Symmetry: C3
Subunit: 134 residues, 3 copies
């Protein structure tokens, strides 16, 4: 298996920040993909499936979630996938994004939310970001 692949997950001990980690069980960062400055770096040109989920939580705002592309050539962030959700017992709100994109070598991808202080990663599998070359 030599396809570029990543499936990174939120650091559960970061406070007020969405920090992606690969060195967890059931996470991946293989075959050229790099995690640099919290972004995923594409090893080769091609079509990639790109996806991410966040979970928000509260008790008693507009919340969005975006995956953006930084082109190696044009050093400016373009949204590839984006969603917005409007929300004392607790409430939860997931958002999922995923699509296929042609990327070039060295592009960086970030999966970002506007209010990291609303994230819930109390349990595994709740907040994640991945790519696979197809």
């Amino acid at each position: 298996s030599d396809k570029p692949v990543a499936h990174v997950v939120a650091n559960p001990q970061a406070e007020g920040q969405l920090q992606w980690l690969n060195r967890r069980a059931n996470a991946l960062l293989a075959n050229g993909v790099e995690l640099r400055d919290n972004q995923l770096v594409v090893p080769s040109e091609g079509l990639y499936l790109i996806y991410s989920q966040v979970l928000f939580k509260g008790q008693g705002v507009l919340l969005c979630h975006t995956i953006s592309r930084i082109a190696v050539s044009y050093q400016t962030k373009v949204n590839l996938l984006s969603a917005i959700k409007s929300p004392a017992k607790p409430w939860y709100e997931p958002i999922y994004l995923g699509g296929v994109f042609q990327l070039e070598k060295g592009d960086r991808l970030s999966a970002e939310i506007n209010r990291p202080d609303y994230l819930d990663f109390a349990e595994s599998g709740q907040v994640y970001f991945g790519i696979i070359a197809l």
Copy 2:
């Protein structure tokens, strides 16, 4: 790269209609896939990953989103993937659908919502529809 692929996005200037476009940056329509009468036409038999997202917006209904298959042989629409969501400051509501399906040559796929007048495509990456042969 010779895999059939499409990633089409809502026309932001259509009013009250979900019109899919490929001639945008970060959109795709390659290797046999066609966009005909707002539907995606499958070039060859095989397994395809199929997906789509819509974003709804309001201020101050049942809203659904479906991907359907028209078989070349049986000219009738079958839902492959479907979701329903129940919703003066603004509110937003995304819906995501995605799955793998065996399709035959010439099948048409549509990604449809019941109330296009509730869609929000004010910004890129909010409303999209894609397939990839796997």
Copy 3:
């Protein structure tokens, strides 16, 4: 086409239970994947894309949805993907999960909700669970 693949759907006649079926049109269970005791059994090691959607309905709770891995070696359930949603006319709430994972031969996957009595499968395409080897 020899890739392991499954796309299973909720049994619409089960009452208060999420029972996955493959013997429906537009469903799949091919090339080694097995459905045993309501779980999907992986035929070979490799990277798999794994996904599932549920739809909840009510009229007039915390609702979650998880895909878990049972390792053949370690017979304990780990959540791979999980989401929680907080909700007389009817209301509906979808949840979608999907990610790429390295699995080993004989692993079992389950897609589970905590309140099957809230599920809505009145129509096709609403509740589904699939994998594809990549």
